[PDB]
RNA sequence: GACCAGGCG
DNA sequence: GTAATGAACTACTTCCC
DNA sequence: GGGAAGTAGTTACGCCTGGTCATTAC
């Protein structure tokens, strides 16, 4: 009870920004009080899938290569 | 001398049990006579309850608040399915022979899937799984394996009708539909060896029962009436409903006495059919609700379990309770973090029971004698029989005489007694804390400032809840577990939660900056 | 003249807490009460009779295994509505 | 009768008499104005009205029937001390209760064991 | 050693023995309702009540 | 159901309540005696109309007319007065 | 039957008991519980005696009493169908005559008095046989075997034993010698 | 959740209690729901604890 | 007692 | 005088050409 | 078969004020 309460509570002072920048540096990824419930309830399929792709150490520290 | 229950089973009922049960049989489709005395045979009957006073309940005695009513039945004319295993019934039909009762499986396959459930019968999701399979494998096949005989495909259409496909020339078919009189008989013939297969019990669950033989009547006490101050009688829904279903059989066992074509009898069913359908659920798919006179839809059993207002949600996990009070909330630094200001008009209305020894016999007397208008008094006192008595102003100087070890008395509140305070939303687990009593002439509730975060509160409106524990138990419960000192870190992160807040970082900061300086006697008050 | 409700995250925390006879005051002995005569051998309720101050089970002829327990009678009323469906509840009681 | 039981005996309504006067001795030494309820006192009245022989004695008798013949049990053995029989139909109607009957010279020799 | 629910259950069944005829093992000054007289009692050390653990 | 014979205390023998009386909580403004309920033959039943149970104050004026049906009718006004304190906002 | 049976009960001791040691308590709890309060399948308690073992007690909660496990004696009397009652005619009536059995009274019914006809001799209140001239009074100590028993609640008042009484071996202490007599004719002739 | 009243009290009541009346389901009442509606004492807490006293105690 | 509308934190 | 009724969401289940 | 497409189930907690009901044709 103690653990639910204390992931509960915090959510209803809950803040959203959602910038929606055209930068492709800034990736639009859906943020807060809906990803928490998406989390939390299992979706399926994401509504905003991403991935993060690492490198090598090969082709690590070269732009063109990337 | 005193049990508690140990576990609750499950099951249906069958007719034997409803018409042993039962205490009457009703008949009559009416309520009260003229003169306002219950109809023998009604769905009034004395005989399921009494709730207007004046009145015995000849089942047993009783009084009119001491009765707890007793059950009815009604003799359905022809059998009628229940809605609530309407779409079992259509799965066990299904997925066994036409007429011989088995099931559409050998016996190696029998064998092979009782090893399975065997195992893994405590769970839902598993169990539900295994029983999908043999379903979806029994439904293919169009001939029965332990007996010879040809099958036909099944339709269902909701609510509550079946439809069979059979074939009149190999290119010509027609749909057959299938009464209730047949499809009991179809489902008595199911041996009990394989109904672990199709997921029943043969002790209290047997498929014929799902098809209603009687019903039964809920008592009196479930459906009470309110007289109204125009004289006119106020009536639950239930009774209506089933008024109109004890016409509706009525009228149809009439007709099958009195003989009638077969298109008479065919609709009545299906009236009487509709009429039971909506009086278990009125919000069953495919079907229009039962309207009453004021166009509103009626509520009925299924409506009474389930939603905010249902018995589950409403009354069993939250009720309304007894000693408690509520007012608006001003601030008081004056007091420590662990008291409440209480006005002296509460203070005189809640009452903490308290036992007499011979450690506070002198107290008690003294508190006696003040009668229930001077503030440090009592309003009730317990014999050792269990008679409750009211103290007047006639009774205290000889109640306060008789008063002796083993007696009870209903004092007012004092300062050191221990309440419970809570504000809502209570969002986490510090939303309700015990406080120590404090008295205080004027008719708001006082809050010591550093407490305010917990409680998220602020003096603009807001008003707050106040709880009296009354058994010595329940009041050393909260004076060792929900002190207010006892939470100052907050179990979320681990830091402090009750502090300083607005002026008390303003004037630490002109205390204690630079070139800060006082005389002797600012510093002398300021320490006294 | 009405009482405060008691909701049901005044429950939750009540539990977090950890006070569980806190919870039987408030919830259980503020509210209804009630004693109820329970037949030891079928699980039914059993019938007292006020005339002749006997108590017999209705439904099977026991009259020895008898028994008091108590509990809240708004679970006596969901009792009696559940068995207004057909739908059996069957009770097996234990010591203590 | 509580949980259960752990053992059992049988007495003769002649150990039954002092059974009951120790009850009388005691509460009368408590002060007691009745030291035996209703048909506590009836009980002592009619175990003594049938118990001039002794108590110990009744036990004695039990246990020499009890190596007389070893189908004898104590609860027989009790009940012949308890009723004085004197003749053959006596025991007969004693023993016609019960499935098992008394032979004639078993009856001769409880007759010698009855003795006073 | 206690935990605190013990403390507390402890605490509560003495309280309830208190007030109904039991006699309280140390002197109290008079006027003192009796949930602090056991409160009291288990601050002095002299509380019979004993818990048992699996 | 008669209450306590101190709460028809300032009713005149009309049945209604003299202007400018002081009137505390649970007093009887209009004294009405309803016909006997079916089960108490011959036996009126007392369903007078009284100040809520946590409000006082004196009465202000009595009006006495007729409903649209013939039935009498009657309105009583009571005045308060409230000066601030602690909580009002 | 009088009888002694060991027992094994769970008993509470009240909080004023608390300062008197536990067997005595125990002791009076149980001539409380038990001395009013007996068993059809077991018989009527008449005394209990020293209760040889106690156990810790047990708290629960709600009551706040002491609950203790205990094992101890009774001495129990336990009426059996077809047994030979030893007991005096208690009063008599017109529909049946009350023997003292032991804690409660029986009843032999006038149909169960003899196999003569008996008739309710109103002049002292008591029977008398038509042709045997055999009599029945307030004080008469007789034996006679049972035919019927019943019992129905802990309260010993309410139970009720009927007895044959002419069976052979039966009967009132003088036909019984006028029955010998009739036996050691028949086996010197 | 094994009970059925914890499950009931939830979501879609009618649809549980028809299913577990089916089954012929049994509850234990081994959780905490359950017994607060019933009105019984909760296994959480303080409700756990169990505790033994010797009676012959005197006053010191 | 159930509905409808409007407010307070 | 009374007897008589007249908007979003999400995950399953059923198709289906 | 794996794409429609059509059901089926939910949507924060208290408290206050006032107003309306609770059949009708003959
Ligand atoms: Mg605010
Ligand atoms: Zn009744
Ligand atoms: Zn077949
Ligand atoms: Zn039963």
């Known amino acids: 009870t103690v653990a639910a309460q204390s992931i509960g509570e915090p959510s209803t002072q809950m803040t959203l920004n959602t910038f929606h920048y055209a930068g492709v540096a800034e990736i639009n990824v859906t943020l807060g009080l809906p990803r928490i419930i998406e989390i939390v309830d299992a979706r399926k399929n994401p509504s905003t899938p991403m991935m993060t792709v690492y490198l090598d150490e090969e082709h690590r520290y070269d732009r063109a290569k990337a | 001398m005193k049990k508690v229950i140990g576990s609750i089973e499950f099951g249906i009922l069958s007719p034997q049990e409803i018409r042993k049960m039962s205490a009457v049989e009703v008949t009559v489709p009416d309520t009260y006579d003229d003169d306002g005395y219950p109809i023998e045979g009604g769905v009034m009957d004395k005989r399921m309850g009494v709730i207007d006073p004046g009145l015995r309940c000849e089942t047993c005695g009783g009084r009119a608040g001491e009765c707890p009513g007793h059950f009815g039945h009604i003799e359905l004319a022809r059998p009628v399915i229940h809605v609530g295993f309407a779409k079992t019934i259509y799965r066990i039909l299904e997925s066994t022979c036409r007429e011989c009762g088995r ?100 002790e209290k669950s047997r498929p014929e029962w799902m098809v209603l033989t009687v019903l039964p009547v809920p008592p009196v006490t479930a459906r009470p009436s309110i007289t109204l101050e125009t004289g006119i009688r106020a009536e639950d829904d239930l009774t209506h409903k089933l008024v109109d279903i004890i016409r509706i059989n009525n009228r149809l066992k009439q007709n099958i006495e009195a003989g009638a074509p077969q298109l008479i009898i065919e609709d009545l069913w299906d009236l009487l059919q509709y009429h039971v359908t909506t009086y278990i659920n009125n919000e069953a798919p495919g079907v229009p609700p039962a309207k009453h006179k004021s166009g509103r839809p009626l509520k009925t059993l299924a409506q009474r379990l389930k939603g905010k207002e249902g018995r589950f949600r409403g009354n069993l996990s939250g009720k309304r309770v007894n000693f408690s009070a509520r007012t608006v909330i001003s601030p008081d630094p004056m007091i420590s973090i662990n008291e409440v200001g209480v006005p002296v008009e509460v203070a005189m209305e809640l009452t903490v029971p308290e036992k007499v020894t011979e450690f506070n016999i002198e107290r008690l007397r003294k508190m006696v004698l003040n009668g229930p208008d001077k503030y440090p008094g009592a309003n009730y006192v317990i014999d050792p029989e269990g008679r409750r008595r009211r103290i007047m ?25 221990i309440v419970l305070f809570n504000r809502q939303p209570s969002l986490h687990r510090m939303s309700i804390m015990a406080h120590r009593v404090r008295v205080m002439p004027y008719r708001t509730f006082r809050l010591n400032l550093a407490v305010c975060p917990p409680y998220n509160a602020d003096f603009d409106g807001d008003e707050m809840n106040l709880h009296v524990p009354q058994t010595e138990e329940a009041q050393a419960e909260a004076r060792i577990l929900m002190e207010v000192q006892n939470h100052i870190i907050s179990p ?10 607005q002026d008390h970082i303003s004037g630490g900061y002109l205390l204690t900056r630079e070139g800060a300086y006082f005389t002797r006697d600012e510093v002398e008050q300021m320490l006294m | 003249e009405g009482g405060l409700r008691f909701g049901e995250m005044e429950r939750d925390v009540l539990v977090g807490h950890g006070a569980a006879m806190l919870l039987i005051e408030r919830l259980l002995e503020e509210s209804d009460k009630t004693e109820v005569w329970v037949c030891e051998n079928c699980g039914h309720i059993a019938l007292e009779d006020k005339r002749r101050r006997r108590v017999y089970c209705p439904v099977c002829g026991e009259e020895e295994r008898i028994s008091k327990v108590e509990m809240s009678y708004a679970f006596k009323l969901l009792l009696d509505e559940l068995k207004a469906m057909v739908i059996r509840p069957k009770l097996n009681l234990s010591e203590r | 009768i509580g949980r259960g039981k752990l053992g059992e005996k049988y007495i003769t309504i002649a150990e039954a008499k002092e059974l009951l006067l120790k009850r009388r001795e005691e509460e009368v030494k408590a002060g007691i104005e009745e030291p035996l309820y209703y048909e506590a006192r009836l009980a002592l009245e009619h175990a003594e009205r049938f118990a001039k022989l002794p108590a110990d004695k009744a036990k004695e008798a039990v246990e020499e029937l009890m190596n007389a013949f070893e189908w004898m049990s104590d609860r027989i053995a009790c009940k012949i001390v308890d009723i004085m029989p004197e003749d053959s139909m006596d025991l007969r109607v004693i023993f016609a209760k019960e499935e098992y009957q008394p032979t004639q010279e078993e009856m001769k020799q409880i007759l010698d064991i009855l003795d006073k | 050693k206690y935990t605190r629910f013990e403390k507390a259950r402890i605490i509560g069944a003495r309280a309830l023995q208190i007030s109904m005829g039991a006699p309280v093992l140390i002197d109290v000054p008079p006027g003192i309702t009796p949930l602090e007289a056991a409160i009291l009692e288990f601050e002095k050390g002299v509380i019979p009540i004993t818990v048992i653990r699996p | 159901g008669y209450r306590g014979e101190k709460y028809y205390r300032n009713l005149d023998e009309d049945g209604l309540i003299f202007p400018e009386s002081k009137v505390e909580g649970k007093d009887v403004l209009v004294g009405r005696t309803s016909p006997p309920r079916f089960l108490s033959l011959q036996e009126r039943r007392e369903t007078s109309v009284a100040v809520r149970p946590s409000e006082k104050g004196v009465v202000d004026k009595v009006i006495i007319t007729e409903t649209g049906d013939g039935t009498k009718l009657v309105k009583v006004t009571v005045r308060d007065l409230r000066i601030p304190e602690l909580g009002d906002k | 039957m009088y009888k002694i049976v060991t027992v094994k009960d769970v008993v509470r001791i009240p909080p004023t008991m608390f300062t008197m040691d536990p067997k005595e308590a125990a002791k009076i709890i149980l001539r409380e519980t038990y ?107 007789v034996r006679a075997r049972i035919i019927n028993i019943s019992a129905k609640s802990k309260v010993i008042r309410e139970n009720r034993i009927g007895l044959t009484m002419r069976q052979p071996g039966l009967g009132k202490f003088e036909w019984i010698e006028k029955e010998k007599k009739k036996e050691k004719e028949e086996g010197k002739k | 959740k094994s009970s059925v009243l914890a499950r009931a009290a939830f979501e879609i009541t009618v649809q549980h209690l028809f299913e577990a009346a089916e089954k012929g389901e049994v509850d234990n009442l081994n959780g905490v729901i359950e017994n607060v509606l019933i009105g019984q004492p909760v296994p959480v807490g303080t409700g756990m604890v169990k505790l033994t006293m010797k009676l012959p105690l005197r006053p010191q």
């Not at chain 2, 539900?128 to 007996?147: D, F, G, L, T, Y």
């Not at chain 2, 006639?394 to 070890?405: H, M, P, R, Y």
């Not at chain 2, 979320?492 to 807040?501: A, K, V």
């Not at chain 7, 006038?110 to 309710?120: C, G, K, T, W």
């Open chain 2, 492 to 501: 979320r992160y681990g830091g402090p939660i009750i502090g300083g807040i």
């Open chain 7, 35 to 141: 001395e009013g309060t007996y068993d059809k399948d077991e018989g009527v308690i008449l005394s209990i005696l020293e209760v040889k073992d106690i156990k810790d007690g047990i708290i629960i909660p709600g009551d706040g009493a002491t609950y203790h496990e205990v094992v101890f004696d009774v001495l129990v009397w336990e009426p059996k169908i077809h047994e030979v009652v030893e007991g005096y005619v208690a009063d008599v009536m017109p529909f049946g005559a009350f023997i003292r059995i032991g804690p409660i009274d029986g009843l032999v019914h006038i149909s169960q008095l003899m196999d003569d006809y008996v008739v309710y001799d109103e002049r002292n209140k008591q029977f008398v046989g038509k042709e045997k001239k055999y009599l029945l009074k307030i004080g008469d100590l």
């Open chain 2, 103 to 202: 099931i559409k499986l050998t016996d190696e396959e029998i064998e092979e899937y009782m090893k399975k459930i065997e195992l893994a019968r405590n769970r839902r999701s598993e169990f539900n799984e295994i029983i999908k399979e043999i379903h979806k494998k029994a439904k293919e096949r169009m001939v029965c394996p332990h007996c010879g005989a040809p099958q036909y495909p099944i339709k269902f259409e909701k609510p509550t009708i079946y439809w069979e496909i059979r074939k009149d020339e190999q290119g010509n078919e027609y749909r057959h539909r299938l009464m209730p009189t047949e499809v009991r008989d179809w489902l008595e013939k199911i041996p009990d060896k394989d109904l672990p297969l199709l997921g029943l019990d043969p």
């Open chain 2, 393 to 417: 102003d006639s009774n205290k100087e000889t109640l306060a005489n008789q008063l002796d070890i083993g007696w009870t008395v209903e004092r007012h509140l004092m300062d050191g007694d």
